[PDB]
Design an enzyme around this catalytic site. Structure first.
Site, short mmCIF file in Angstrom:
data_model
loop_
_atom_site.label_atom_id
_atom_site.label_comp_id
_atom_site.label_asym_id
_atom_site.label_seq_id
_atom_site.Cartn_x
_atom_site.Cartn_y
_atom_site.Cartn_z
N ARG A 98 -8.39 19.07 26.66
CA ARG A 98 -9.46 19.38 27.62
C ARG A 98 -9.39 18.46 28.85
O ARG A 98 -9.35 18.94 29.99
CB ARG A 98 -10.85 19.31 26.98
N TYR A 130 -3.55 16.16 5.83
CA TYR A 130 -2.72 15.95 7.00
C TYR A 130 -2.13 17.27 7.52
O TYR A 130 -2.18 17.54 8.71
CB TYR A 130 -1.62 14.94 6.69
N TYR A 133 7.07 11.61 -0.27
CA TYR A 133 7.87 12.82 0.01
C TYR A 133 8.99 13.05 -0.99
O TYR A 133 9.72 14.06 -0.90
CB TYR A 133 8.49 12.73 1.41
N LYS A 145 -2.68 19.24 11.46
CA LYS A 145 -1.65 19.70 12.39
C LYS A 145 -1.57 21.24 12.52
O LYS A 145 -1.25 21.75 13.59
CB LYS A 145 -0.29 19.09 12.04
N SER A 198 3.58 18.73 13.34
CA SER A 198 4.40 18.17 12.27
C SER A 198 5.13 19.30 11.52
O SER A 198 4.70 20.44 11.56
CB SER A 198 3.53 17.32 11.33
#
Ligand SMILES: NC(=O)c1ccc[n+]([C@@H]2O[C@H](COP(=O)([O-])OP(=O)(O)OC[C@H]3O[C@@H](n4cnc5c(N)ncnc54)[C@H](OP(=O)(O)O)[C@@H]3O)[C@@H](O)[C@H]2O)c1
Ligand SMILES: NC(=O)c1ccc[n+]([C@@H]2O[C@H](COP(=O)([O-])OP(=O)(O)OC[C@H]3O[C@@H](n4cnc5c(N)ncnc54)[C@H](OP(=O)(O)O)[C@@H]3O)[C@@H](O)[C@H]2O)c1
Ligand SMILES: O=c1c(O)c(-c2ccc(O)cc2)oc2cc(O)cc(O)c12
Ligand SMILES: O=c1c(O)c(-c2ccc(O)cc2)oc2cc(O)cc(O)c12
Lengths: 261, 260
Positions: free
Chosen positions: A127, A158, A203, A162, A144
């Site tokens: 904005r 998370y 991960y 995104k 991501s």
């Protein structure tokens, strides 16, 4: 003397550019010819270093402190950029935080910690960028690969922060069109920064029992190029997007994972 | 046992007093499920949905809870479990819609939409994981404007559902340790109060058309030349939450009748 892909005469602002992907992004826009507003929230000394790095390569930079969770500070951050450098052409929304947890244990507080920066923050950077930017400007936000392309257990909060960004930029492109401003996002995969080392273990199945070197060396095998993503890899892409030549890339998310997906 | 049916199962649907939620609630009732009907304001309408479900030979109860407030989602779910003994199916449907050019969107407007459409739904799923019995079903509600349909001045709402799209894909991974499936339905223009609330924003010079012209136009979006109705969404939710639907897991189903 107009060189293709260069940003001579342009002014760029990158949030969270004291360190990480944002630092590389900020320096890179400086090498390309732009003057840069280096935004930080905590890392004063690192932001200074980025400012110095940029001045040494033939450009100009200022460091402005602003928490991007506070919208009044975004407004002030953009007001100061325009005041100092005369006009603003390019905004990169980079600031972000990472989060892990099985759904069952995700708290209200953790939800707001993550969304107030990754989503609400980036939204209002957008904005304020639309409100301050010159005609033909450039806005890149940060998504991501876990938003759509990569599914990681215990990573719902998370990923969704995104996923919101992914929708934002496609519609932002429509609105921002009346100032001839393109809006995109970049969605990096494993990129070696402080964030990466903080969570590389989430991960990988049984990642705590591997070293920090070994985990990074496994993330490298995700891509068919057999190497990690580096802050520079994002910077190279942001740098194309924000140039004159990237104009026809608009309303898009570019997944930058070296072909992992 | 009859297939696609939900005899002996128990379901919850947020904001099922009216609109799409109402048709989902009644349809889950028709299939044999007992239903907890949630509302925030629409008391009389919720009590009618309850009657509808009792009328087709099932049981239901109306519970007032504001889905923006997590401590109220928590109570909704405790009270459901306490009333029926167990909960199998949770549909997160409650939503609100929003239009505005980026330049004009306020802090208050952002929070208004996200507290319900995103944060709200997120914690409805959390409480649903916590409360549900093994092999249960969770379905959240998204939009064709999330990925499939691009409307100007629609950035905030579009974003608020894009989050939900990413949520259910990952939710399905965590929710599998109880054998619970998580998906989302993403309707196109479906005829509820919300449709009439915004149908002019989907059409160039929309305020120059009557509402009935706008609805007729929206019917031409489908190659089937009809509007989406709450029952269309209800039918698919019905199938997702049945035993036969188990292999659809972690997905967002766009229901626009082929518009995209
Ligand atoms: N690393 C990856 O593999 C990866 C993958 C996908 C997406 N990303 C995204 O890429 C972006 C940068 O990631 P990174 O790896 O460089 O993260 P990082 O190393 O942790 O750096 C975080 C950056 O965000 C800034 N920041 C944090 N809180 C802020 C706030 N409240 N206001 C303004 N700035 C704030 C930090 O500045 P201060 O030090 O002053 O707090 C710092 O510059 C993030 O949006 C991240 O989500 C990274
Ligand atoms: N209709 C469409 O064309 C369309 C298209 C795409 C997606 N959707 C999505 O489909 C869902 C169903 O919407 P609809 O079309 O039926 O809209 P609607 O007719 O306006 O119904 C809204 C429902 O949301 C509930 N609600 C609102 N605020 C609430 C709160 N604070 N706490 C709990 N419940 C609340 C309302 O309950 P109370 O009135 O009692 O507050 C009502 O039951 C929404 O999530 C919407 O985003 C609809
Ligand atoms: O840390 C990361 C990581 O280790 C991996 C990864 C590791 C091993 C694999 O085999 C595949 C991926 O991806 C990532 C993707 C991100 O967006 C962010 C990260 O931090 C990582
Ligand atoms: O109201 C709506 C509407 O009119 C249309 C539409 C689509 C194509 C047309 O040609 C004309 C209209 O789509 C919609 C999609 C939504 O998710 C929600 C809506 O409320 C509408």
């Amino acid at each position: 003397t107009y060189i293709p892909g260069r940003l001579d005469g342009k002014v760029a602002l990158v949030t969270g550019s004291g360190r990480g992907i944002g630092a590389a992004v900020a320096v890179h826009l400086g090498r390309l010819g732009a003057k840069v507003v280096v935004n930080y929230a905590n890392s004063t000394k690192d932001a200074e270093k980025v400012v110095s790095e940029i001045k040494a390569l033939g450009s100009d930079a200022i460091a402005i402190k602003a928490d991007i969770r506070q919208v009044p500070e975004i407004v002030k951050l953009f007001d100061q950029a325009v005041a100092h450098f005369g006009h603003l052409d390019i905004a990169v929304s980079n600031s972000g935080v990472v989060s892990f947890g099985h759904l069952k244990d995700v708290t209200e507080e953790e939800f707001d910690r993550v969304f107030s920066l990754n989503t609400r923050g980036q939204f209002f950077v957008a904005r304020e960028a639309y409100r301050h930017l010159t005609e033909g400007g450039r806005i890149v936000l940060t998504s991501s690969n876990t938003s759509k392309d990569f599914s990681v257990p215990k990573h719902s909060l998370y990923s969704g922060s995104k996923g919101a960004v992914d929708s934002f930029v496609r519609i932002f492109s429509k609105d921002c069109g009346d100032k001839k401003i393109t809006v995109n996002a970049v969605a990096p995969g494993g990129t070696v920064t402080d964030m990466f080392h903080e969570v590389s273990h989430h991960y990988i199945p049984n990642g705590t029992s591997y070293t920090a070197e070994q985990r990074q060396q496994m993330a490298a095998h995700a891509s068919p190029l057999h190497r990690n993503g580096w802050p520079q890899d994002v910077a190279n892409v942001v740098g194309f997007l924000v140039s004159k030549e990237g104009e026809w890339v608009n309303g898009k998310v570019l997944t930058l994972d070296g072909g992992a997906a």
